[PDB]
DNA sequence: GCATATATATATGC
DNA sequence: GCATATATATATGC
């Protein structure tokens, strides 16, 4: 037996890779609960999106099948259908080998959300079967895997097509043995695709559930502005949607703002169309140049007096709705961990802060009335915040 | 030439493992700053700690070399010195292959910090050079890597040692090309190792910084009680140090708690001697149980009434300082992410909430004067909080 | 029908 | 500059 009194060469083991991910899923998707479960879905969809963000495809069709598996069809270029430089088909590289793919700087993708090269393999490793249909250059190629991403067929030609017809169609059963639930939730996927559809002013995403025949479809002519509105729908707005966009040593930033009656700060941020829910170097940029440009503004118009300290950030965000969406080139792309919740690209902080800072300073100079009322609300906020502290402190 | 318009099988690159941690350092230590740099220390210490937790090593010393490299010596069993079955020294397999080790429950280890099979390998990949030295079985073996972990010797026997003596000595220089800083910080390391000491009664930990001639040692006999006591040192207490402890399903919970005249809570938790700075299922059951037990004591003794609302867990934790250290078995260990920052194992919410609730019940039932000052403390809390709500609301 | 989680929303302090 | 907890709503499983 292996011991403890007996730690020899025999005791160190090497996982075959997809096996590493079956053993330590937590490292790759976070958790094996339903939140875990849906990260598989996001991995495949992010792949169709990265195709669309490079220019290929105007339609992604997610589909919960009767039997419980899920499908992502796109009209992008297709996965390469030949022999890879390593003696199994390239598709087989995508799905079974880790740290492999097109987004390492080579030039196959423009800006793009994937960057680790694990996504499709992680989905593959964690499924009890998985199928690919590629459409390329007149032909349709299929291949299947079973029992933790194990090839059971080579890539294999099964049909012809119109020649203009291209794209990828993945379908996987998540593994009952890995996940405490394998019940895909139509409500979760609907809300995700909707989030994504905002971010492709030119794309249509769809979800179809053959379990219930429910179906929805998303499309948005004005993108991040439509996003902000959709955050303030059944709410009551105290400003028109501000829309600021710009570029800067290859960064591309798009931002939409609109205040509401409310008191919440509610601001959503995205690197290369990938929601970064914990914020990051980009969100900090925005937060910054609001507080700077508002405080600077109110000092220049005397509405915060001279001997009067500077409002705080909380104040200026109280009631805010903001969608921030940056494209960051691959050479500058850093997130904080195999996930993609937080953004560590130190360049994004001056990028955004810079671009925002200019656009905003110039919006207020133009709408004096709107901008004064924004500074008066901010003043009212620090008044409330201070009254709470006054109180909480009196009581001790 | 590889572009958007020419994407066939050469646009997919396969990164050799250690190159991947160099390509995407965020996925692997989350940042390439002072915080990332100090991650490379903690991985090598946790490896040493893991030996002591299985019973091997009474000592762990850490040195910041004049040249700015850092050593970590342990007297544990030493890494296996022979030939791994994949055809290379086992030492090599540790420092150069990802997803490899003795902690996937094979028996080499009891319960350990580590579990991913990557830490040693990450430190090597991010180092201008790395040197191991194993003492086992009468011999001192030694092996050197350069240029992000490519081996420049093999595992070479370099001399003699006495036949019962054992240990591993890991020296590495962080790679200045990767990190924005490679100054190791003595205060930082001091602090971490202090804390690693409170959980290792059988180990004395050392830090020497040959840059400046300063050293500290660390040894504790009392675990989380010595830890809580130090957490409160220059504060004023208002309670003895409380210590619960219990076992369940092979898990082991230990926790120390103690209150101060302050308004802050100070909960520190640990899985397998590894610090979980974001909590996780085990901190949460810790907190759950404090709250539920204390409101039950509230209503049973009548300091809360029918008409009154249950107190928030926030109220009960003001001035709280606590250290929760659990031991969780490999076959249940699971973090959210590669990062070990928060625990994700489901069975630990019940276990810790079981052990503490039972134990803390028993204690209030029997320390009623104190139990009532506590409850009264949470109330005057709640009245501060609920004073701030009204005095804020009364401002809008 | 009971308690389960789930979608959402505010709350400062170190 | 940084971490969610829950408050209480509703929807759904034991
Ligand atoms: N739908 C698709 N269409 C075309 N190519 C694809 C598609 N999905 C994956 N690929 C290719 O397969 C590679 C592997 O992607 P993937 O396994 O998800 O990792 P990745 O996109 O690079 N980066 P990450 O998603 O951060 O893991 C990609 O880089 C693409 O070249
Ligand atoms: N100080 C040491 N003494 C003895 N064996 C060691 C030591 N350091 C590492 N090892 C061996 O190397 C293996 C892998 O080290 P490491 O790569 O950091 O992996 P891990 O500790 O298993 N997993 P992880 O640390 O989760 O990032 C361990 O399982 C041990 O067998
Ligand atoms: N009393 C408080 N305790 C903890 N966090 C707070 C408190 N008051 C405000 N916050 C912060 O308020 C933020 C709300 O803004 P969000 O857009 O969700 O990001 C959170 O990130 C909290 O860190
Ligand atoms: Mg991807
Ligand atoms: Mg380790």
Residue numbers in the entry:
A (entry chain B), B (entry chain A): 5 to 400
Sentences from the paper on this structure:
Bacteria usually express two highly conserved type IIA topoisomerases (Top2As), topoisomerase (topo) IV and DNA gyrase, involved respectively in chromosome relaxation/segregation and DNA supercoiling. Topo IV is a tetramer composed of two subunits, ParC and ParE, that form an active E2C2 complex; likewise gyrase through GyrA and GyrB subunits.
We report the first co-crystal structure of a topoisomerase ATPase complex with T-segment DNA captured inside a cavity formed by the protein dimer. Two ParE44 dimers were present in the asymmetric unit (AU): one dimer had a trapped T-segment DNA duplex in its central cylindrical hole (with evidence of weaker hole-bound density in the second dimer, likely washed out by the two possible alternative binding modes of the palindromic DNA to the second protein dimer). The 14-mer DNA duplex penetrates through the 22 Å hole in the protein formed by the ParE44 RNAse P-like domains and is mainly in the B form apart from a kinked region between basepairs 3 and 4 (i.e., between the first two AT and TA basepairs after the 5’-terminal GC and CG pairs). The DNA experiences in total a complex and asymmetric 39.4° change of direction. The major and minor grooves of the duplex are oriented towards opposite RNAse P-like domains of the ParE44 dimer and are almost equalized in width due to kinking. The protein-interacting 6 bp segment of the 14-mer duplex DNA, 5′-GCATAT is asymmetrically bounded by the RNAse P-like domains comprising an upper arch formed by protein residues in the region 269–291 and by the short helices comprising residues 316–322 at the end of the anti-parallel β-sheet which also in turn binds in the major and minor grooves of the double helix from both sides of the dimer. The structure reveals that one DNA end is bound in the ParE hole and is bent; the other 5′-GCATAT DNA end is not bound to protein, protrudes into solvent, adopts a B-form helix and is unbent. Thus, the top strand (asterisked in Fig. 2a, d) is bound by residues derived uniquely from one or other RNAse P-like domain in the dimer (but not both), in contrast to the more symmetric engagement of the bottom DNA strand (double asterisk) by pairs of residues S268, R396 and R400 contributed by both subunits.
